[PDB]
From a paper:
Here, we reveal the extended and contracted atomic structures of an intact contractile-tailed phage (φCD508) that binds to and penetrates the protective S-layer of the Gram-positive human pathogen Clostridioides difficile. The virion can be divided into five distinct regions: the head, neck, tail, baseplate, and needle. Structures of purified φCD508 virions in both extended and contracted conformations were determined by single-particle EM of frozen-hydrated samples; the resolution ranged from 2.6 to 4.0 Å for the extended phage, and 2.9 to 4.2 Å for the contracted form.
At the base of the capsid sits a unique opening, centered on what would be a fivefold symmetry axis in a complete icosahedron; it is made up of 12 copies of portal protein gp45, forming an opening through which DNA is ejected from the capsid. Thus, there is a 5–12-fold symmetry mismatch between the capsid and the portal. (K) CryoEM density of C1 portal/capsid assembly showing the symmetry mismatch between gp48 capsid decoration trimers and the dodecameric portal assembly. Inset shows lacking density for the N-terminal arm of one portal-proximal gp48 protein.
Residue numbers in the entry:
A (entry chain B): 13 to 43
B (entry chain X): 3 to 127
C (entry chain A): 44 to 143, 145 to 287
D (entry chain B): 93 to 143, 145 to 287
E (entry chain G): 16 to 127
Write the structure that this text describes.
């Protein structure tokens, strides 16, 4: 018979960059 | 995944090879110190301390079993090509005498006029 | 199918370690997780009636039989899709007590509803649908809106509850055997996170087919209903309350 | 390895790249925030919970105001707040003007521009569990954002793959690295409880 | 013609009548100690790892501390690692000591 999969919601949660409002970014490859 | 909608079951796939193991992190004890590109015996591991460390710091030892140019030998001894090399931890110098020293290598190029030696490093047995 | 199949997926695992000058980096690991399995059942009822009963009886007709079939079908759907929520043995993690201070107004259920929202969020779920009984519809509906000023305290309306559904029991007397579907007990309610862990599985929603007839008796075709359905409930979504 | 690649056809390098990105973002949060979490705050920077007597749980409002008083009297300014996700609902209730209660209306907490809800992050690799301890529930941190916190980005992230001298059974291993550094401070943080 | 035929990172063996190996576990088979890359049954061919690499494992005797640097000996009878240094075979040296979960990181050795 036909095979059907229960399309359930799994997978690890996405992670967000929460630090940005605090730190003052300094970007330079010369450091 | 906390608060997931569904009680999913997670199955681990085992994996033994954590790393290539060509070098090992080690922690300095009280009576130990290191500087870069110098051979040391720290916590049973012998290798080239690639970084400086003085007291309770972390350093890494090259144990690649490659060929190494060392000097820092007991100058009185002769080091012919092929002779085994032992590390005298008390004197912190390489030597061929095998009294109570760790076997660490075999000379590839004999002791030149400036006491330089090339030798293969051994597998830390 | 008669029984569904679990979803599968792989995931890598790694952690970024400090890499001091020229050391060996420690590798990661892969692992797999699998979903659950759900299945669908079959339901059916019907009627038998002689041709003489249909032809001679003025009020009887197939229309009322179809009405009864439809009513019982809707009640069956409510039972299938809400009895897993009610009959579940909720652990102490889900359950939340009444927690009403000394002699409040009965809109002090606002205290219980707010904490049910709080416990849903602290458990990383969230309540959006509230289920209760009609025995406290007026109290609950007054509680969702801000209660009147009490001793100089104007409580706020409860937000993040899209809809509230009241599911009382359904009863029917077929012949001499009565069949009852248990509704929500009065007082107890269920705050639900909807349509993420709850799946409605349908193959045939409903099919009223005329059945075989005994022509030798002049008995009409057996009108019979039939639905092939199923449900997949959960516990991660739901939080019980009291009153 | 080849064996891993050949067991399940669902496997691909994409999930490995996704794991790399996820762990990298978690590491960024860890490096930048865990100085605030793990610092040994002294009495100057610690303010205790002050639930007077059987108060509604929005008595955290008076704790946050006391935290602001500690920063301002110390000539700091806690424009940012950091707390756990567990206490999130009571924080917005406390941040906004709490509802009228016993004929006493408490004004909204204004100067807190935003609040960061930072829970931890745990991953199981092999037989080792690595956990970046997020904000402990109850305890919260108030921060002056930009003055004393400098992020140093030399190389955000670069992933590379190679099989120059690997085993026959090992497919090309994937490695990612990033040069980064962060400068924290005690000039900016006040540690709240509840 | 070349004497070298393979890098020697892995070696094949044939399971005996009293030996059976599952994927990614340590097994001493025909004098070769390594990590089996296949789930093997009696008289079947599997491939071990002798890569001289750092390896993770918890299949240890949980009685004595495996402090870093101590030699690791493989006990074929109990099928466990240990620091006994008795007639058991030498297989590696600890890089990272035992944790609360009894997990060990150690470097394999060249089967001498």
């Amino acid at each position: 018979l036909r095979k059907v999969v229960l399309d359930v919601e799994l997978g690890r949660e996405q992670v967000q960059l929460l630090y940005k409002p605090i730190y003052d970014s300094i970007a330079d490859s010369n450091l | 995944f906390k608060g997931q909608p569904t009680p999913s079951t997670i199955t681990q796939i085992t994996r033994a090879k954590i790393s290539d193991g060509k070098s090992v992190r080690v922690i300095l004890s009280e009576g130990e110190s290191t500087k870069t590109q110098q051979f040391y015996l720290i916590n049973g591991f012998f290798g080239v301390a690639m970084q400086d460390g003085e007291k309770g710091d972390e350093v890494t030892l090259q144990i690649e079993q490659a060929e190494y140019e060392t000097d820092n030998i007991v100058t009185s001894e002769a080091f012919e090509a092929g002779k085994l090399i032992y590390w005298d931890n008390t004197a912190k110098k390489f030597t061929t005498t095998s009294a109570s020293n760790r076997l660490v290598g075999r000379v590839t190029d004999g002791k030149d006029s400036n006491n330089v030696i090339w030798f293969i490093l051994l597998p830390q047995q | 199918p008669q029984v569904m199949d679990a979803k599968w997926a792989l995931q890598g695992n790694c952690v970024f370690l400090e890499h001091i000058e020229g050391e060996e980096i420690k590798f990661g690991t892969i692992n797999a997780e699998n979903g659950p399995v759900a299945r669908i059942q079959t339901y059916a009822t019907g009627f038998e009636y002689t041709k003489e009963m249909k032809d001679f009886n003025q009020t009887f007709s197939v229309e009322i039989l179809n009405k009864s079939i439809g009513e019982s079908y809707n009640a069956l759907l409510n039972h299938i899709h809400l009895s897993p929520i009610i009959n579940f043995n909720y652990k102490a993690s889900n359950k939340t007590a009444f927690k009403g201070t000394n002699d409040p107004i009965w809109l002090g259920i606002w205290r219980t509803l707010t904490q049910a929202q709080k416990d849903t969020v602290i458990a990383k779920r969230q309540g959006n649908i509230l289920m209760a009984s009609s025995a406290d519809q007026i109290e609950i509906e007054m509680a969702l809106n801000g209660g009147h000023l009490l001793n100089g305290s104007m409580y706020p309306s409860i937000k993040n509850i899209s809809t509230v559904i009241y599911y009382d029991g359904w009863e029917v007397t077929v012949g001499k055997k009565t069949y009852s579907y248990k509704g929500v007990t009065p007082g107890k309610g269920y705050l639900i996170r909807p349509k993420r862990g709850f799946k409605e599985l349908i193959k045939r929603d409903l099919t009223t087919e005329v059945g075989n007839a005994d022509l030798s008796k002049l008995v009409e075709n057996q009108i019979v209903g039939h639905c092939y359905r199923g449900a997949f409930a959960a516990v991660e979504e739901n939080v019980q309350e009291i009153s």
